[PDB]
Amino acid sequence: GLMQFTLPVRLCKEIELFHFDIGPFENMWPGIFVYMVHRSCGTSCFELEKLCRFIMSVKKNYRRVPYHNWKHAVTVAHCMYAILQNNHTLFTDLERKGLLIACLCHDLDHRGFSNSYLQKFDHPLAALYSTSTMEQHHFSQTVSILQLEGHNIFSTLSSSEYEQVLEIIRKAIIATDLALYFGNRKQLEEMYQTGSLNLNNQSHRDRVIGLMMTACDLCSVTKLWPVTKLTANDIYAEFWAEGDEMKKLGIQPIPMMDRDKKDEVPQGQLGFYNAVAIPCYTTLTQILPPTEPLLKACRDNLSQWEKVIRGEE
Ligand SMILES: Cn1cc(-c2ccccc2)nc1COc1nc2ccccc2nc1Cl
Ligand SMILES: [Mg+2]
Numbered sequence: 001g002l003m004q005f006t007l008p009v010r011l012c013k014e015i016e017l018f019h020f021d022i023g024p025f026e027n028m029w030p031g032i033f034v035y036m037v038h039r040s041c042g043t044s045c046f047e048l049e050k051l052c053r054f055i056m057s058v059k060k061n062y063r064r065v066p067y068h069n070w071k072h073a074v075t076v077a078h079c080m081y082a083i084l085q086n087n088h089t090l091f092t093d094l095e096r097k098g099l100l101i102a103c104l105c106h107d108l109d110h111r112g113f114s115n116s117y118l119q120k121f122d123h124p125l126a127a128l129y130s131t132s133t134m135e136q137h138h139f140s141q142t143v144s145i146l147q148l149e150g151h152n153i154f155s156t157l158s159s160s161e162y163e164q165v166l167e168i169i170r171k172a173i174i175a176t177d178l179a180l181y182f183g184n185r186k187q188l189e190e191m192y193q194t195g196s197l198n199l200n201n202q203s204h205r206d207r208v209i210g211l212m213m214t215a216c217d218l219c220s221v222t223k224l225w226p227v228t229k230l231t232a233n234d235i236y237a238e239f240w241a242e243g244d245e246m247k248k249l250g251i252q253p254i255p256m257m258d259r260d261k262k263d264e265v266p267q268g269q270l271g272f273y274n275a276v277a278i279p280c281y282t283t284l285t286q287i288l289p290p291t292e293p294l295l296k297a298c299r300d301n302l303s304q305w306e307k308v309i310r311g312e313e
């Protein structure tokens with residue numbers, strides 16, 4: 001009850017900033033997450049023993065892949081923490097509870113392969129879940145862990161609060177399917193500019209939480225340049241392995257996944273900042289003005305990729 005987590009001074013200050021990097025010490029990531037729940041939600045939100053058992057079972061169900069790993073889970077939860085802390089009064093008690101957990105769980109048991117690769121492979125998960133294949137699996141793995149003995153962190157909620165939080169988590173996790181982001185953002189763009197955006201309309205909140213989820217999930221583009229640039233190596237290590245696996249099925253992969261086309265990465269990052277990241281953080285900033293540092297950091301990183309193309313690095 002009286003047991004705070006406390007971080008060293010540099011981490012205590014920097015964890016509050018959007019561009020915080022959780023560092024290379026894996027054993028500190030659980031404590032960093034509990035710290036964020038305790039400040040975001042409260043020391044009362046979860047029984048510490050249950051929360052600790054939940055976190056360690058979640059960790060165990062992330063795989064040793066280059067990018068879609070336990071570090072990504074905690075990184076995406078920290079971005080959500082910074083959004084929630086900068087928008088104190090906009091979110092319900094249940095939302096603060098659900099969203100940090102949703103972010104920690106959002107890529108559970110990822111294999112380092114896209115929905116496309118599973119469908120082309122004819123993976124069993126592609127027959128069980130015809131759209132948002134991996135994201136339905138990530139939600140399925142979250143419910144599994146919540147149902148293990150001693151892992152039910154929501155046990156003090158009523159039946160209908162419990163149903164609501166699990167529905168916040170399902171929609172949050174489904175929204176991390178980038179195929180769904182383009183339409184979600186166009187609708188938010190229209191709603192904001194015709195003035196119809198209403199945060200009391202549940203279906204509107206759902207859309208805004210979905211964009212928050214895209215923003216947290218892509219947050220590697222919002223770090224200081226050396227973090228962004230080194231994370232890009234991990235992202236492409238997966239893409240290129242998928243490309244190899246497409247070539248094994250007798251399919252020329254897209255260039256983004258073809259390691260023979262490494263030279264075109266700087267131009268591919270440009271397209272992604274312009275087509276995905278910038279539009280994402282721009283619409284997020286219009287809806288939630290205090291998230292503007294994410295858009296500013298993304299813009300700085302776009303400018304760094306422009307310098308790479310110009311051979312200035
Ligand atoms: C779109 N695109 C095309 C290329 C390309 C590269 C080499 C050769 C030919 C084409 N690279 C990208 C970059 O793509 C992404 N970067 C991400 C960065 C961070 C977090 C999620 C991301 N998700 C995606 Cl999909
Ligand atoms: Mg994912």
Ligand SMILES: [Zn+2]
Pocket residue numbers: 072076106107176217
């Ligand atoms: Zn993710």
